[PDB]
Amino acid sequence: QISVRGLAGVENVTELKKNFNRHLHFTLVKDRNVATPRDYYFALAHTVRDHLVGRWIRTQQHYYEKDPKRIYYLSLEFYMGRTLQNTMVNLALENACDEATYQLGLDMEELEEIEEDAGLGNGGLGRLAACFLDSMATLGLAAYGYGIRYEFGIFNQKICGGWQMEEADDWLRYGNPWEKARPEFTLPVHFYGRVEHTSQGAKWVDTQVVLAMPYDTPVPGYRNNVVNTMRLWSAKAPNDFNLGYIQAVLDRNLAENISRVLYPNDNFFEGKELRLKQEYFVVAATLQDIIRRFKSSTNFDAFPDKVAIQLNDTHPSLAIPELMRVLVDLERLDWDKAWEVTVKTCAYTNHTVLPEALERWPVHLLETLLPRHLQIIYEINQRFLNRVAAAFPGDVDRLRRMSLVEEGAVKRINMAHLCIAGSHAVNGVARIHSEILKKTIFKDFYELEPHKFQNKTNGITPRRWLVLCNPGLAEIIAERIGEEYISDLDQLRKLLSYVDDEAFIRDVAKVKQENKLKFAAYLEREYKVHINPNSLFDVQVKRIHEYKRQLLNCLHVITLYNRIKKEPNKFVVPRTVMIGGKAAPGYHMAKMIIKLITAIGDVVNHDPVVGDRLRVIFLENYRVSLAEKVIPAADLSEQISTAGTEASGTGNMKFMLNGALTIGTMDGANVEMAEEAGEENFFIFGMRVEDVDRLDQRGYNAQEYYDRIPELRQIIEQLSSGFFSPKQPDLFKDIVNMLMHHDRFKVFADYEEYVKCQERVSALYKNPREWTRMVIRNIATSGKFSSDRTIAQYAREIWGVEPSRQRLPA
Amino acid sequence: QISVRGLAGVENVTELKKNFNRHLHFTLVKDRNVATPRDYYFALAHTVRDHLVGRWIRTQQHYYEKDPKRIYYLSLEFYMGRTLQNTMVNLALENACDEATYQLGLDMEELEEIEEDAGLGNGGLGRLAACFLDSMATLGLAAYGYGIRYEFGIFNQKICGGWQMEEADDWLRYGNPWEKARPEFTLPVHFYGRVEHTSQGAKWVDTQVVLAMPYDTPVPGYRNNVVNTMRLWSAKAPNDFNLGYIQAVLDRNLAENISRVLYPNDNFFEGKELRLKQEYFVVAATLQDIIRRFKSSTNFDAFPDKVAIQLNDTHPSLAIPELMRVLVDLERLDWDKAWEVTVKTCAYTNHTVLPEALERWPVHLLETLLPRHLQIIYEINQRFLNRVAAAFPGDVDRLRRMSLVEEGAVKRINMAHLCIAGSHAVNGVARIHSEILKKTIFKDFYELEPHKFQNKTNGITPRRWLVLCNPGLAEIIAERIGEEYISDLDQLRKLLSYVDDEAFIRDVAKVKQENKLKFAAYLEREYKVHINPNSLFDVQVKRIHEYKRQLLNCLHVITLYNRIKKEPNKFVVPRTVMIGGKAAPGYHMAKMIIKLITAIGDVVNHDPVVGDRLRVIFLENYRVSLAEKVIPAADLSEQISTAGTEASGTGNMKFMLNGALTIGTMDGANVEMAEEAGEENFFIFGMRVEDVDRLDQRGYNAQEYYDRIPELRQIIEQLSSGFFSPKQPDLFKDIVNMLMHHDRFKVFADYEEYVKCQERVSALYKNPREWTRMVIRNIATSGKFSSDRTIAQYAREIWGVEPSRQRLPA
Numbered sequence A, B: 001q002i003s004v005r006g007l008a009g010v011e012n013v014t015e016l017k018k019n020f021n022r023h024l025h026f027t028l029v030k031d032r033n034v035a036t037p038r039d040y041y042f043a044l045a046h047t048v049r050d051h052l053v054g055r056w057i058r059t060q061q062h063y064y065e066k067d068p069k070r071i072y073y074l075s076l077e078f079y080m081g082r083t084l085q086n087t088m089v090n091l092a093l094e095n096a097c098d099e100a101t102y103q104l105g106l107d108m109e110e111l112e113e114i115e116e117d118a119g120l121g122n123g124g125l126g127r128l129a130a131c132f133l134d135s136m137a138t139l140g141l142a143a144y145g146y147g148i149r150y151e152f153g154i155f156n157q158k159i160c161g162g163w164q165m166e167e168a169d170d171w172l173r174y175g176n177p178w179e180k181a182r183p184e185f186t187l188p189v190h191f192y193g194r195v196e197h198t199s200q201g202a203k204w205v206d207t208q209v210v211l212a213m214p215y216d217t218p219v220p221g222y223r224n225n226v227v228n229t230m231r232l233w234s235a236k237a238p239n240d241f242n243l244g245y246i247q248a249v250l251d252r253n254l255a256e257n258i259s260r261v262l263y264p265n266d267n268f269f270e271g272k273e274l275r276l277k278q279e280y281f282v283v284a285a286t287l288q289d290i291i292r293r294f295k296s297s298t299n300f301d302a303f304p305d306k307v308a309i310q311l312n313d314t315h316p317s318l319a320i321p322e323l324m325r326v327l328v329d330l331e332r333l334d335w336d337k338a339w340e341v342t343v344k345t346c347a348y349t350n351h352t353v354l355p356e357a358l359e360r361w362p363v364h365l366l367e368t369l370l371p372r373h374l375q376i377i378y379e380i381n382q383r384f385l386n387r388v389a390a391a392f393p394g395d396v397d398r399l400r401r402m403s404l405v406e407e408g409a410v411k412r413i414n415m416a417h418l419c420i421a422g423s424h425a426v427n428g429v430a431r432i433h434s435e436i437l438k439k440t441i442f443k444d445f446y447e448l449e450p451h452k453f454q455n456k457t458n459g460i461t462p463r464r465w466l467v468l469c470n471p472g473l474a475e476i477i478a479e480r481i482g483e484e485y486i487s488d489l490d491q492l493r494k495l496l497s498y499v500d501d502e503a504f505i506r507d508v509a510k511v512k513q514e515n516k517l518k519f520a521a522y523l524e525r526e527y528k529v530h531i532n533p534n535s536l537f538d539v540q541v542k543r544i545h546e547y548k549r550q551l552l553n554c555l556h557v558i559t560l561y562n563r564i565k566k567e568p569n570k571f572v573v574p575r576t577v578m579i580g581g582k583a584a585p586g587y588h589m590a591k592m593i594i595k596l597i598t599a600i601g602d603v604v605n606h607d608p609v610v611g612d613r614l615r616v617i618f619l620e621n622y623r624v625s626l627a628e629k630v631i632p633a634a635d636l637s638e639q640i641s642t643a644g645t646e647a648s649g650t651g652n653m654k655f656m657l658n659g660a661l662t663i664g665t666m667d668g669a670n671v672e673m674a675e676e677a678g679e680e681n682f683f684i685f686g687m688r689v690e691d692v693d694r695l696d697q698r699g700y701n702a703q704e705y706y707d708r709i710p711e712l713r714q715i716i717e718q719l720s721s722g723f724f725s726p727k728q729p730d731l732f733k734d735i736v737n738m739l740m741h742h743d744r745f746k747v748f749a750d751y752e753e754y755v756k757c758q759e760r761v762s763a764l765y766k767n768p769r770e771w772t773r774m775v776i777r778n779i780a781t782s783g784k785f786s787s788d789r790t791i792a793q794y795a796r797e798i799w800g801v802e803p804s805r806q807r808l809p810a
């Protein structure tokens, strides 16, 4: 149908058809008379998977032969989403598969909807890991993603009576055709035990053993025949575990629980023993695999020339002391040599400055679970502080601040300090964030070792986030500038030559309109909700958090409602306000925010005076597959975190690529997006980081805003008095109390500027030609936010390897 | 190579080779440079599986179209063993696969050794279920085996310091290529709750739900293109189960434990709640499947014309009240109509008379777990006893004896009484056993309803237990009488015409010798033990039990040792005495018997005066795959249970088919084997059932035998004084005390006759020509013991269906 989906040649189509029928019969053991759509989805998935296999085998062979430097990306989260469409796009099979299925009487788009998301992450951090794998394969890097194969990924969200309920995400129920179990490469991981000091060094003895069994998933690059590996570990008890008899067998679950469930917290640290087990499990299995592969290619001096380990936040920080353990206790290197190797091998990416998200493990947990690692951490700390003392003599407070060990009621290990000490590179994830790291929380470390500190601004893959989710936009772009932009997104700048072209303006607006109609129908079909597709689609999708300020959006929505009720016969630009996202199950305030959003909807959506001028919809079960549907449909992207709190953001970049304008604060990557597009093409409002600091110095008093802004006072009185909860008048008192007395994120302080900025948005939306011209200016300057750019920078500036766009032979 | 293994045609061989390479590449994702023997085994298994699929689909289609009466064989155990070779034999692919693999540079016999046994049974009962499935498919019956897919089958046995240690049987670790998950046919099963009585009958409410997910395994018939289904249920928690968050997800194990592990007791009842859950789980899921299939083919009068349910012992006895529950509570049939349907549908096979093996569930367990089923059981009981009272007026003791409810400290339900009441047919498993049922434990029931009581003597499949395990014997038979005997084992009678044929005598002896050499080499390779292959191979393999009298064998072995030590320079026929079998983990005396056997070996095998004249070997990890190796190698089969205790036995029949002579008591099927072969061709000894009864009436006094038999006294003094345990002189005191004071199985009472009979065995072994002629007489008369015969009798006399040897089209 469309050019960017590839060729549908007669021989290709014939072969796909016969292999589809082969898999239905032999693999699924069904005849066509009782096959369901799910059976047809599996038969297609197996057919497409067969095309990956030859390339996967050849790619891994090529790495064994050439022996390039290997990149190991360690993460507790890989938020992959669905695989079928992405695989077809990357192998140029989409049009052929569409045709093959069409000729068999099937609708491929319907089959695609049957696939479960692989939901092995919480949000941005996990999704970044997934985008990075796609870019590393596309850039020809010998890269491996290592993680945990959780049996249960991020929970499915149901809304009941306006409240979030959680259900287990049993994503493997029907099988996962993309993975290959490799039980032959199972490795042991040790826990508990004690340390014995012999004459030939330390020995970690009397341990409990859990086995780590790997499952491998192919990661195809874009049209280059490179297929890399994501290796995910699953926990298995040994066969003599606990070995009355029946109970001993049932108690194997105690070991296997390590890989059972993803911790469902976004940007928050929960210091539970099971989480610590997960972190060590992934590190210990991965490092054995790395060392095996290195030995099969005695002399560890070359280790950093052949291996890079990238730590995705501090979650895999135990890699540092584990590498030291292996090199010192098992390989018998002297400490100084081992430390040199470790530092040159490891690099640390920080993704947050919120204090509640920083990992600080109690010493007593590490002492019991990982006694040798604790000894190694203490030794690292002593040697590190000896360097600090020599550089800054007499500065005793600096020694306390920089210590890996935090004093207090409970002594804790600061994992970020460990990562900085043991890594040759430390980066933040947007320019403003990397500057904040150097000026505030890691200032001391920067003064000691300025050379370590870098920036690598985040990005998103344009394969999933343009070609896959918005083929109509990809096509109209390709008609003008060709297809090369898909792996070289900077070529979108060429679109600035079309900003005055009437045909292009029309086509851009037409694609948005089609995406809106398609999303409005999806809503009606799957959720029985009716929306006006001529309205401005105002969208805030992201995890529910105080710092992300869904509450500020709520205040604007109520302001609009109150303005309509005051002057009902005045024209206002119609809006559909859509908010979606999961709350962590234990995060009470986030759960209350969801309830407020649905409660506002219950009033606004049923007021006959409002009509179709304002609708408030809570989008249930926000996840990667839903992002792919809603983001192409959005007109306005809400990126409204308090300045200094969102390290980068990546949803922001997805919306920019897909033809939404952005209303946002100067936070995270929003700063760089505005710089690329021009501030005149962005709806910037609110306090900058410097203004937040000035307010904190004099003291934030929310009462002052309440006293001075009548529209704000009215909303608080409505919340307090039960206007949005007539049967439970005090339902929102915790929200009111927080806003008035304990608001760390200064919602009221940005309210006036936010409302005024929203009025400018509405004014521009009234002039569709100028709205669309501004959109073109945003899409055209979005090239910097390709994860291909991000990964090329990591490769050159951190890993010491050169990217390549050259194809392997087919 | 040999004719009974089929044709190796050029086109077949070419196609197997290309499909093998296809599976290695696409299914296993390996290239030949790193493939292991395990990868090659899987590639062959997938290649062979592909040939089953078309036949499986066609067979199940044919049943949907023709709508024959369906046979449902319900069992807690299916002891399947390995599948690869059996599938090749039944599809006539063995020679083609041998050739195809040979041309690829691989040895198929080595690949076959990699496959795990499917060990989902304890011994005879589970293995009978497996033989029956093979015979039902071979006889063209629309039959389904229904059971539980245990994650852990019968434990792997290790011997350490002469003691049994247990290890989990992680049989699914590398995957199971034979099964197909069918998550789309998942069904709910209810537990706990309470009963509400409305105006429209009873309702079982407030239950906990566990999901039953089926896995289907193909069951090929012998060369007839019929492939039936074994459907095994696996337990899954619903997604809202327990739905802080993390703990709720981890607690899904409480539901999923139902299918985790096989209870490892043979011929013994352990009344644990988990076992009861297992029994209901299999019944409840199975019955829904049965009813679904019946409705898709309102009027339950035709139910018994379309459905037969065979209960494999009382383990699935809850089928009776579950069927009543469904028909009365859900379909709203009146009680009397429902009961008529139930009785005509169900039939019960009893497999034991040992009191400790009979299921008697405490009422309090059923009251909590299955409250509606308990109410239905009480109603069945009241109506049943009303019939008894009308037939035998005033016989109040008979009412107490026949009640389904047993009075006492703890009230219990007698499940055997429930099965008799609710079944149209009740059978035992050998003639002597079925007579014992009518004369002793079910005498009262027989007097009320004599028409219900039948015999169906057990059998074994000649596919696995001759063709597969002893191809050399199968071939020399086939050279004389053709191949038809493999599905019509009565044709072996034709071999009586060859009993004086010198060439046949030579060939029979040569095959045995080859099997002995092959087994003697296996022992050396896998277990570092050396045996004399010219010795008489004296074999007792079966689960370790007091009633099976491994101890009587032990007394004979010590007698032989003592006779050698007394007269070392006298000739004795050399023997290798092999004993193997698993002990239930909680069965202390069985564990002590294993220790005694290894302790005897430690003395006998290292005494230089004995030399190679006597060796005692404990065969570790006895299981179906080991039976296939040792049984073809045996000269003497030990079948020495106390008369009246072994319901049938089936190992006995395996040995007869494979050219061993039998030393045995007149117990179980030994009686019928002796009758078929002639008593002159069998080594019969010991008390008959009648002699056991006479001894019980006057009182068994073991001291009398000790006082009268000096050789026996010497052995007991050796045991007591630490001759076989010098470092722990009192190690065997429990064994001595049991033999002298509390022996229910009268070991001493059969000792003298056993030893004398063993002397006759040795005398015959000295004359190889006459030994071999007696062997031919046994093999020739073994035809009655085909499970094809057994199944034809069930089909005609119980199920009301006609067997068929006609082939479906290929």
Ligand SMILES: O=c1[nH]cnc2c1ncn2[C@@H]1O[C@@H](COP(=O)(O)O)[C@@H](O)[C@H]1O
Pocket: A057, A060, A061, A064, A293, A296, B031, B033, B034
């Ligand atoms: O010893 C070897 N001989 C031949 N090829 C090897 C060997 N070791 C690794 N390879 C190749 O590279 C491997 C990739 O797996 P890895 O061990 O995870 O790196 C295999 O799939 C082979 O293609």
Ligand SMILES: O=c1[nH]cnc2c1ncn2[C@@H]1O[C@@H](COP(=O)(O)O)[C@@H](O)[C@H]1O
Pocket: A031, A033, A034, B057, B060, B061, B064, B293, B296
């Ligand atoms: O509604 C139907 N239409 C066509 N074929 C059916 C239908 N129901 C069952 N079958 C056939 O018989 C089935 C065997 O599965 P069953 O439901 O377990 O008996 C399928 O595999 C079909 O081949």
Ligand SMILES: N[C@@H]1[C@@H](O)[C@H](O)[C@@H](CO)O[C@H]1c1nc(-c2ccccc2)c[nH]1
Pocket: A122, A124, A125, A128, A265, A266, A267, A268, A269, A313, A351, A352, A357, A429, A458, A646, A647, A648, A649, A650, A668
């Ligand atoms: N909030 C940032 C977000 O601004 C950023 O775009 C994303 C990727 O760098 O990482 C997110 C992030 N997620 C975590 C996180 C996730 C799970 C557990 C603990 C921390 C820390 N940081």
Ligand SMILES: N[C@@H]1[C@@H](O)[C@H](O)[C@@H](CO)O[C@H]1c1nc(-c2ccccc2)c[nH]1
Pocket: B122, B124, B125, B128, B265, B266, B267, B268, B269, B313, B351, B352, B357, B429, B458, B646, B647, B648, B649, B650, B668
């Ligand atoms: N001992 C008989 C044996 O004589 C008989 O050959 C076999 C098959 O009928 O069934 C065995 C049997 N096994 C059980 C059993 C198995 C597991 C749990 C409880 C009872 C009962 N009966």
Ligand SMILES: *Cc1c(COP(=O)(O)O)cnc(C)c1O
Pocket: A122, A123, A124, A127, A541, A542, A543, A622, A623, A624, A627, A648, A649, A650, A651, A652, A654
């Ligand atoms: C991109 C993405 C995120 C991150 O969005 P932010 O607005 O940067 O927090 C979270 N969840 C999903 C499902 C995503 O695709």
Ligand SMILES: *Cc1c(COP(=O)(O)O)cnc(C)c1O
Pocket: B122, B123, B124, B127, B541, B542, B543, B622, B623, B624, B627, B648, B649, B650, B651, B652, B654
């Ligand atoms: C046949 C068989 C049995 C039953 O043997 P009996 O001597 O009848 O108790 C037990 N276990 C295995 C592995 C078998 O093949």
